Design a binder for this molecule. Sequence first.
Ligand SMILES: OC[C@H]1O[C@@](CO)(O[C@H]2O[C@H](CO)[C@@H](O)[C@H](O)[C@H]2O)[C@@H](O)[C@@H]1O
Ligand SMILES: OC[C@H]1O[C@@](CO)(O[C@H]2O[C@H](CO)[C@@H](O)[C@H](O)[C@H]2O)[C@@H](O)[C@@H]1O
Lengths: 19, 19, 19, 283, 283, 178, 253, 253
Amino acid sequence: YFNINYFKDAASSGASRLD
Amino acid sequence: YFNINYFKDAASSGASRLD
Amino acid sequence: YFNINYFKDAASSGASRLD
Amino acid sequence: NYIDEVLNEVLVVPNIKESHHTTSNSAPLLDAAETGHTSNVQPEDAIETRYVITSQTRDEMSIESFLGRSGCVHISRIKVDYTDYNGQDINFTKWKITLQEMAQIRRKFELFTYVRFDSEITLVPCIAGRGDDIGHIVMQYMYVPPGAPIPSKRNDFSWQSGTNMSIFWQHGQPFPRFSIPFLSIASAYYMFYDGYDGDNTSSKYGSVVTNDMGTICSRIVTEKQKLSVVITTHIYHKAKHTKAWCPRPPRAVPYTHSHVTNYMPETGDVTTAIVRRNTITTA
Amino acid sequence: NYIDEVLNEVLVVPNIKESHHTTSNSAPLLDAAETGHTSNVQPEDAIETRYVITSQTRDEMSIESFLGRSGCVHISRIKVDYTDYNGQDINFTKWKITLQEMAQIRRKFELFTYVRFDSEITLVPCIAGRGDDIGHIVMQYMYVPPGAPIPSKRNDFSWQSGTNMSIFWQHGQPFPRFSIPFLSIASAYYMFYDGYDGDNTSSKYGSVVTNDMGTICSRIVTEKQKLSVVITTHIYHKAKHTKAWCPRPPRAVPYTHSHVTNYMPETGDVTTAIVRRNTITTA
Amino acid sequence: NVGNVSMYTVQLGNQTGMAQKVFSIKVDITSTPLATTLIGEIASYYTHWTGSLRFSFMFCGTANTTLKLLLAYTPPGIDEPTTRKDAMLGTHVVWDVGLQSTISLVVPWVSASHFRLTADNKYSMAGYITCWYQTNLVVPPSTPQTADMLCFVSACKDFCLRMARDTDLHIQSGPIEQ
Amino acid sequence: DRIMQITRGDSTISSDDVANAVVGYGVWPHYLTPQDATAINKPTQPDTSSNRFYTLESKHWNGSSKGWWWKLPDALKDMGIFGENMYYHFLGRSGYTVHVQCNASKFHQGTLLVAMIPEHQLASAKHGSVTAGYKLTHPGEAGRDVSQERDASLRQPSDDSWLNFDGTLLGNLLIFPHQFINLRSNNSATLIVPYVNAVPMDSMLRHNNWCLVIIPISPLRSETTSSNIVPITVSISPMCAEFSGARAKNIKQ
Amino acid sequence: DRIMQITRGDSTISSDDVANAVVGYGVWPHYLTPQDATAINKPTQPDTSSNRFYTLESKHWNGSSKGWWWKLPDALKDMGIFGENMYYHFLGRSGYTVHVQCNASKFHQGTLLVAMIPEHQLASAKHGSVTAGYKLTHPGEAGRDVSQERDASLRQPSDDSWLNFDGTLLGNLLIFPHQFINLRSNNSATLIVPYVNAVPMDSMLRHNNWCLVIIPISPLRSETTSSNIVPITVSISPMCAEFSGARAKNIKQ
Ligand SMILES: OC[C@H]1O[C@@](CO)(O[C@H]2O[C@H](CO)[C@@H](O)[C@H](O)[C@H]2O)[C@@H](O)[C@@H]1O
Ligand SMILES: OC[C@H]1O[C@@](CO)(O[C@H]2O[C@H](CO)[C@@H](O)[C@H](O)[C@H]2O)[C@@H](O)[C@@H]1O
């Protein structure tokens, strides 16, 4: 389960990723 | 996640879009 | 979102349709 | 779309190109504003500009993010009584719907002549304990469209809502919220009006002649309690899926009364936001 | 990605190869640190190493797991009053946003010159009962961006939030939480600054000249209650989607005041974490 | 003047001296006289502003009348100029009053921070704009010797705002009745 | 069409009326070429910040006015940036744009002759071999003459107009790049002029290449209140300024 | 090989001995890009005439010396051209090259730690919320400390070294771009540094981006005549200077 930005804005999202 | 108008009527929906 | 009769019986369902 | 919509880069502004000097005839800086039109002059025209690739969106500058924000438009209050329950015109509120019982928001629209939109109403009931225990205070918010039995008092027959809408909220369970279609017999909601009821030199004239959308009646279903209370159910409103026609100059005089323009303060000189300067020469 | 990300094996450290002896010219152990650079010598260089396949990730050593953790940055308090409700500057709090009103966390950033990120604010209201029954105490947390009507007192006109953000929490319903975009006119949040307001030998100089992000005003909507209370709404903050530029030496002197570096304690000699030894000869 | 209309006109006068100054206002678009303006009134709904801006002036003088003003934009950095020379040194536009009538002065965007605050802030100080006489106001016989100039401000395609917030320019020290 | 628009720096000038514009010797001002050059260092070329539209001190047009001149390399010895770069460097080279504004009404009558002049060696007012003094051919924004009074002790030039100050019947002056300001048609005068000099870059201090003259030919005549003053304003723009031979800094005088 | 040669203007510097050179954050200083930009006007970019090798005031290295700093945007508030363009413009942006010279003999013993620091918000010497004063974080060629005495009435910074003046154990200072001058191997120190700041072009007057510190770590120790003075000389070169937001001119202070 993931990438389901339930919210529109980007500022709202999980902790970013890593690379 | 989107376009899941959980409700029937149109008056009920998120803030419209932009174009 | 629709036709997800979460319940078994038919008596339990949304307001019918129109036709 | 996503990216553009998630990144909020839908409406982007142009960039400022590079310029060079101009020792030439056509003078763009000269136009006659009397034409009532607006000049079209830019940085690049007037100066020797550089090159800036922009990245500012005019997304938040959309009638939907300008309008689409919840605002207190009414504060229903009920100082309960246990002495006389029921009685005429008690323990139940009745409000006639309108966006101008509260400056703030009233202000904001008024920026346009006509408007249209689906409205989302959010109810924030707050139960003040004036007793040693508030119990379980259930609530009924009924919407009474024009021409309908408006409860004379608390338990009419109209609280049966056999064909009306009544939302119920019980202490604990969250804020009630519900959307409503654009309600007008007209293609748009008349933010203003230059009409009257009739030729009767005693007829009504304003944004009222036109918008009479019904009322909202509050009740506190629970029956008689022991320890008193006072309920304050706040009414917030948001405009979703909005359109606007013919902008107007904002308001600078604190109004009074609704459905009217009237400013003329009670005695006090009409006050506006403009500040006074000693001299034009120094700012 | 998954496995690597679920197993948390994204940033792995190299292994320690095997070595043999070296009776050779080039001496890697010798470099001149005056070059300001850092040596590059390893186990394998200095000793006769073996062979260890590693398996330690530097995942948790990322500016996001170093920064991305919620921390108390403010504790809004309201010792209610029922005697005088409203009145000027009462029963409503107003705080000017900042990460340095609380060591802990302030500390942590300060490790870098510049920083940038989207912030997630979590509100933990705790209602202390000083009465025999707290009723239903609703709450309003309004965010006031710079240059805006800040409530003079409890019911201004600014609590209508016709175009502002106000989050509402009612006893029972969970902790309010909301995210906010990077708010700065600048490409990054200035963790520090070596600038001033102006040439005025009385101008301001610090991390303040620059970051004035508005305020957060708390209200307890419910109206007058009987039995008193005191509310303590804790403000936690987390940094999600963070970046950092130019690291700095950590802080070793307990600060005082914010938006300043000043250490100079009130009388007490400046104290630091370093411990004293009798002799260098024995540790 | 202020509670009246005049509050809008700027009469270009005599001027015994020469190279004298007309007026000045500061650019910080949320600062009376600016503020109240369709723009200002607005901007005061957002926390941050940006881009270029346009000031336009019109001669409500006469036909046979003549003049030449010098308008200038003094970027943020120093004090509103006391003298013309000092101000002419930066951004400006000489305006030749003639058959045209409207000169439009652009206010480039000069700033450190891509963005400026709408709220009064020493940092985000946008600067000043001022107007002075280049020549004079000459009028042949039996024409008035004072006349007015109207001034305006519209945006540039540069322009853009953000972070909506509730306004400044309106305190409802009401309520509102019925 | 007569209207004209000119943009030079962060500055622009407009004119709802004009008599064309003139390019001195039909050459447009530009930067020095590695062919005609001589120096060896990389010239500093302030663009915009320097070659912009500086306006001088204004003047009155009298029925007693006689004429006034400004010497260019010199008129901007104070005009910010350009006029600093002047003082910091030995070699300076630059061309200009001269916007001469002078309005009044259509009920006025007057005529101004405007002209630029390569090497305008003025003559002293006093007989002999004594040449005009430095300090007096180096007036500044303010310019010289007007019809003024002064010490005859000073190795003072000729305030004398008709002889051209150089002793050449003014009127043959039309040979130098010029135009007039006939208040009945005109409003301004616009001269644009390249860099003329037997050397690729001269001393911005010792040598003034261009010299500008404005001379009332037909005297100003209104029937108005002498409350009506009709100034004359000069605006200038170094163009393709180039400097070099960096060092300490000269000194004001 | 240690020898180094550097050429910046009309100026060049040599060093028959050195400890490499260092590029701050491994980025080489250059001109602003139309991507990260924001302003709208064409920046003036004095080349050579500006971004050249200016040398400051020299200093003495004492057995009682404690340390001395210079703030860059500020150290050249007088250095010709650059330091004028500073005052004439609102926006200024530029990177530098720091040549720190300090010789003595191979019979001397000493160690200097040199470091540059992005946003060096100093602390006041006095407890409270009173920030250091303008006029004192704006010393000029001359720099600050030495081990000096002064009014405590002035909202005066911390003359305090070990705390880094900012209250961070000096020694962690090694995190900032740096190098030493170990008189037994070294001769100089060379720092090169790009433009670091959350904004494309800042105020050359209100904001000093780079701050430079030189601190005696191991005290100078000879066995010679204290007639033998071992100065410390700093030389600097704006690089890729760019300016804009032309106008009147600020004022000296
Ligand atoms: O009844 C509200 C009041 O505002 C107006 C604008 O003058 O417009 C409307 O907006 C409402 C949102 O609360 C609708 O409920 C409404 O009923 C509608 O007209 C008026 O016409 C109206 O009097
Ligand atoms: O206002 C908070 C305070 O901290 C700084 C760092 O000095 O940075 C910021 O972080 C905040 C998180 O709570 C943002 O809310 C903020 O407004 C932002 O600047 C400061 O500049 C600021 O003064």
